[PDB]
């Protein structure tokens, strides 16, 4: 029974691999031979936010490229104004351990979460707790907003849940990973979202139907972070194999792998630019690298952080790049 | 204009609040309790991670117990990077829990992010099955007591050699590597002994003394 059923899975995987390898006449890095190089890109540090006692773990930009929210490991959620480097808000947290945050698109709500496996939604317009969502039996890793009545969260029990805020119930649950989900990034249509797990795998999920469609496995270690190409037909994944990769949706294969001989450190976060030509990857060697998105050649290096880079963000307008390390110093690059 | 002044006032108030909370944060020492085997000896005088706060000699102490989490721990263990002490409780009864505990300690001892954090080792569950280890380990028939001060509370048979052999294996994993800036603190504790709040106190004090001596380039 079990022995014969594994044969069906093996045959299906063989057929899938044969189909994938059949339609690979052009593998890029051969088509891309007439484009001019990016050149030299150097960014100077403009601002250095210093208001956190412990290591920052995440950050998320607002909808107007100005307001920012930063979550520390000392039970602090600081809402900042980037241009004038002032702290508009500083919310304490019941659970000092925080591993994710999100700024609501409508600009009235905030989301926080950590090892306490509970998602705290805070109002902003005195500051109180709008709601507490007690769901998964694991630990949250990344929470993203859809509207003021829904939220999508990823936990450590191989689960991704869609929540309705008013009733506080799991409207839909997503399973299919054999390891904890590290991070998710919504597509710019609020219809699909990709999620990477700790088994060298990424999957694409549909919010409405609730059924998984496609999986991608090309890495060799955990997929720490995953970001979506602005077009919506590709996404980038960062792993612990000292590599980053680009994956296509319609092609359903692996397009390009960015790696270097000297780099032997992991990748923490990856954020795309508005144009789609640069991929900014934070490394564990305390420095960030800007990679060409079509030539697979190193474009730039940003240094200045003493400890490892924990989180990275790029605004909608594409004006500033925000890096947050474990030295509790946010840095803005332009 | 006038709208900028209100922002300045709000920033000043929030800065004052953060200044007030800085002293409170820096005046408390956090601990990470961890281990398999009789981790229910919590003395106080569903959810994800439980917290316990207590004061010994008017010094605050925080303790975190990892509750509803998956078996795999390679991801959330990185959170406890700046914790003053990691309490590791290892059962000393005998499948083959001792080998798995020793391997887990080895893994947490040679990690990049936990290379600076110090480990306080508890060996609870005093042996009585091994009174009337064995052939599970090979290096037991040619090991003698390492001239250590036997406690001698009234009696001390070969159980002393058994305990010191377990400690010797732990140390041979410990002291054979490690870049620096951390040490292992062995201890012999019973189930309760109504004194385990003092060993942690002394070990934290020693850790701070060593760190400050290393900072002043004296050691």
């Amino acid at each position, epitope marked *: 029974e079990l022995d014969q059923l*594994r044969q069906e899975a093996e045959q299906l995987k063989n057929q899938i691999r044969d189909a994938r390898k059949a339609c690979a006449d052009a593998t890029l890095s051969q088509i891309t031979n007439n484009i001019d190089p990016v050149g030299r890109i150097q960014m100077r540090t403009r601002r250095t936010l210093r208001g956190h006692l412990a290591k920052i773990y995440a950050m998320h930009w607002g909808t107007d490229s100005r307001l920012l929210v930063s979550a520390s490991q000392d039970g602090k959620l600081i809402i900042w104004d980037s241009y004038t480097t002032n702290k508009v808000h500083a919310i304490p947290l019941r659970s000092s351990w925080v591993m994710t945050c999100a700024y609501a698109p409508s600009g009235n709500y905030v989301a926080c979460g950590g090892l306490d496996n509970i998602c705290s939604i805070y109002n902003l317009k005195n500051v109180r707790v709008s709601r507490e969502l007690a769901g998964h039996t694991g630990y949250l890793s990344c929470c993203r907003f859809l509207d003021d009545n829904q939220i999508v969260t990823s936990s450590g029990d191989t689960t991704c849940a869609l929540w309705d805020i008013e009733t506080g119930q799991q409207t839909t649950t997503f399973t299919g990973h*054999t*390891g904890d989900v590290m991070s998710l990034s919504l597509a710019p249509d609020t219809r699909l979202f990709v999620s990477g797990a*700790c*088994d*060298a*795998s990424a999957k694409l999920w549909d919010v409405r139907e609730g059924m998984c469609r496609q999986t991608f*496995t090309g890495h*060799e*270690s*955990d997929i720490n972070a995953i970001c979506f190409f602005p077009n919506g037909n590709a996404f980038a994944t960062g792993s*612990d*194999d*000292a590599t980053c990769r680009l994956f296509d949706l319609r092609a359903d294969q692996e397009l390009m792998t960015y790696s270097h001989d000297n780099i*032997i450190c*992991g990748i923490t976060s990856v954020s795309f630019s508005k144009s789609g030509r640069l991929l900014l990857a934070g490394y564990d060697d305390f420095n960030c690298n800007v990679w060409d998105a079509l030539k697979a050649d190193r474009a730039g290096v940003l240094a200045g952080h003493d400890n490892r880079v924990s989180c990275l963000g790029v605004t909608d307008d594409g004006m500033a790049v925000a890096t947050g390390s474990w030295d509790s110093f946010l840095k803005i690059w332009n | 204009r006038n709208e900028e002044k209100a922002q300045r006032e709000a920033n000043k108030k929030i800065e004052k609040q953060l200044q007030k909370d800085k002293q409170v944060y820096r005046a408390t020492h956090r601990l990470l309790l961890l281990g398999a085997g009789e981790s229910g000896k919590n003395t106080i005088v569903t959810s994800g991670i439980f917290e316990t706060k207590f004061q010994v000699d008017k010094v605050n102490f925080h303790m975190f117990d990892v509750g509803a989490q*998956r*078996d*795999e*721990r*390679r991801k959330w263990i990185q959170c406890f990077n700046d914790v003053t002490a990691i309490i590791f409780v290892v059962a000393s009864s005998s*499948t*083959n829990r001792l*080998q*798995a505990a020793l*391997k887990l300690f080895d*893994s*947490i001892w*040679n*990690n*990049k992010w936990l290379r600076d954090t110090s480990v306080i080792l508890f060996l609870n569950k005093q042996d009585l099955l091994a009174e009337k280890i064995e*052939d*599970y*380990f*090979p*290096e037991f028939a040619r090991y003698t007591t390492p001239e250590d001060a036997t406690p001698e509370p009234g009696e001390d048979p070969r159980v002393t050699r058994a305990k010191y052999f377990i400690r010797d294996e732990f140390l041979r994993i410990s002291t054979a590597s490690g870049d620096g800036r951390h040490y292992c603190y062995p201890h012999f504790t019973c189930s309760v002994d109504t004194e385990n709040i003092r060993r942690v106190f002394n070990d934290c004090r020693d850790i701070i003394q060593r760190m400050h001596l290393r900072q002043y380039e004296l050691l």
Partner: nanobody
Amino acid sequence: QVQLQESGGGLVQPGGSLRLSCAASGFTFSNYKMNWVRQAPGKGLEWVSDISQSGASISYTGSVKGRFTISRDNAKNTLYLQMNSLKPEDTAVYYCARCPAPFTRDCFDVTSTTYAYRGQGTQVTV
């Protein structure tokens, strides 16, 4: 993805020998550490042996040292686990696992929550 196929083992009597070949595909076999894991029926998984990245810091548990030997060959990227002088208490299922990350000594390859870096393994009965 990462594939680990175990070939070897079967019905044997005490004092027999069985080599367990661990064919590894889908990564670079010359960096990650390798380990063997045993599972008795109705019991938790247990650790057996270990080989370093280069292949010089061999390690065994007490019950297997002096009877079992492991070696790594990069050219054919396979593990061996040469077994000798078997005892009737070794009947179990064997898995061949690797550590999650390269160029590091940290390893957490014993969990029973469907760890994705170990194969189906093979049954060894004595």
